[PDB]
Amino acid sequence: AEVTQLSNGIVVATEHNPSAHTASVGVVFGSGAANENPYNNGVSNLWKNIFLSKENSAVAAKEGLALSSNISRDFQSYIVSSLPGSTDKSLDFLNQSFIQQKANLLSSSNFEATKKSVLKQVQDFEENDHPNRVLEHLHSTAFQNTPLSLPTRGTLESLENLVVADLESFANNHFLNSNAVVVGTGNIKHEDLVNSIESKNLSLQTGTKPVLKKKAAFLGSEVRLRDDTLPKAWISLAVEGEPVNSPNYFVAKLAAQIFGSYNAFEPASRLQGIKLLDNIQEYQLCDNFNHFSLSYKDSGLWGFSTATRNVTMIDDLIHFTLKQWNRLTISVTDTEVERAKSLLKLQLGQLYESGNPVNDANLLGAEVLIKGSKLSLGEAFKKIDAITVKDVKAWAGKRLWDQDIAIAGTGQIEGLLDYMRIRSDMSMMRW
Template sequence: MLGRRFASSSAAVKTQFSTLKNGLTVATESNPFAKTSSIGLYLEAGSRAENPYNSGVSSLTTKVLASPLRLKGIENGVYISTINSKEISGITTEFANGNNKAAVELLKQVLKSSQESFNNTSLVANEAKLAGKLAETIEATPRVTVLEHLNSTAFQGTPLALPTYGKADTVSTLESMDLEAFYKKNFVASNIAIVGTGDINHDELVSLAENLELSSGTKPESKNSSFLGSEVRFRDDTLPKAYIAIAAQGESLDSPNYWVAKIASEVNGEYNAHSIFSNFLGSKLSHIIRENHLADTYSHFSTSYTDNGLWGFYTETDNVGNIDDLIHFTLKDWNRLSTSITAGEIERAKSALKLKVLSVSESPLLQANKLAGDVLLSGFKPSSEEVVSRINAITVSDVMKWAQTALWDKDIAISGTGQIEGLYDYNRLRNDMAALRW
């Protein structure tokens, strides 16, 4: 073991990171009060590590590796599953406390029998078929479709534009050779983290992880992404609503303005017309939306990747005759971030953000997924105290300065489906990114 990179602790939860001689990272978030535990093998290779010809291979590879061991895992009290995102994929386990060795042994068997799994053509074909159906299901979900297309048009021409779970007509045709090539390139120790959460002893997991059979190859490099102002529309009047997302270029994970952008997104936050709390939201935009029934829901976001990001909002509305008003008032409110945002609004946004980022999930598996993203993409996890300190230090001036640089008169990416006839042309919407009046 080379050494500890970072450790933080609170009254119950203790977070530790270690790097082994072969480059493998071991991260734990120990909580002796957790009812269950999770250990996962995560790699920094999600859909971004793919290309248009093998789209979906990251998700399919982990599924093929995990599938043959599901029954054995259940027999040993361990539930095995997989996850996939733009920049991370993984094979995860959940189990009752005290079954750590069985979980790691299961992950060890996943690696040891990888070639056998790839050689099982019927297994690969069946999982590819299921993956194709999953992709079709995702593509039929308006919210997911719109946000995937937003990424696709914003980062077009780069791997970051590829769909998270692949395209249905591509993933269903993948074969063993595609999976083997992905495995050989990405399943290397320096590209992997073993993450444990729940009632986990860090040193014990380090000892178990040292016995995993992993290649010591070079960590793959990912192609840089670039933002492009553009739009993609799939009008479908058979859908009951209009589903729309608009975003400007956001901040990367290592950006000094990462938390500033997060706070800016919380100024207007989220709105749901059907929520009993909708009348009590404090943002100016939510009042305009509610009083004029311009949208059923909206949510602002600041999504960050390793080298880029998106800052914007997603909305659904059945008032399809007033889409122009909905978008106009939203983008005008974005203008306020550059000119007239108040200290009270920023303080409310900071409180909302702290509530979100400091909330502890009841599921050790969800905690493990989050911790894996921290260690693989950022190399560390800030303590709660550090997060609070960074958020508290941000001022109205910081937000205004950021908005003047990142939002004011900047290009945008637009994605929409459903009854979007009333979604005006790109130039009309782009012009609303800057105005001389409110």
């Protein structure tokens, strides 16, 4: 399905969907918040809001175009959406506003206003979005003193000292042909997109991105942000996981699907075939939880997140969930593996067939920027169907059984026990 060409230093990747009603083109760079430093943290967040500023969007609206941008730890993207008969109109807008003529966007009275608004978005996030700011501190403590520990939005102190010359420095080092992929998804054709870049002579700078010194290194630790005025307790807990291109990439995702997610107020979520629900529903230990498997270029995280109002029984919630992780290493049934196989395929099928061309562009560019190509959905289903119980036991034995953990929490967390008490629950003396 997907086609990738290297006509020049830039790479062109596409995904033709003839039964769609929109098209999207854009550029994805192989740099994110992991390519900054504590003192300029949030520069890549400021660049996203410059692309989506009022003056830039007014020009695109008059032509019937919509702008989208996303910042991650390993990549950032700038997308333009349009009707199927106006693909060359979007390529021209991307060229004249981003690839070249970037000084008018970076003008004064536009940098100042955009900077003032981003400072407000960051302050609100740090005071209202408790479940998401806890997951950001989990990265901060698991990979402390490392590129992989910097928040994707920046901090109030990095942004407050950012100045006029700081944004131009970053784009020189990172917005280059060797660091970029041009992506077209929706009702577009590979031949029609390549024939348009070769005519307009589109090209970025011809440098090379700097090479970092350190690498990602997991360290067992914890950070606690207690706040007795909040009504709940939010907690995140994880061990070291798998990076992308790991052989055990789908085993770790299947292992997270065995315990899944839960919502106390949804009647159908209380009937799921998860044995953990039998210990936590009698006394209402939590309101919701979800298990994840995050994968980056160098490392990853594997764990779960919870929000609860039962502040006097937090230890029971942590004790019971970790004792269920113990069964992956020693005793996990065939039915649990077969059920998780069917729910992982459904979950992946929804993510890669959402029908939104903007979502597909982000997933396509990020995959090509690392692996060089993109694995087919049918090929992924074959690998998922081949996992056995012996593969789960081997994986969990080396990653989960008696291993260090990282913990982050906020709210009413007086009932969360010490590190060593929680750490000692990662195995058991009975086996």
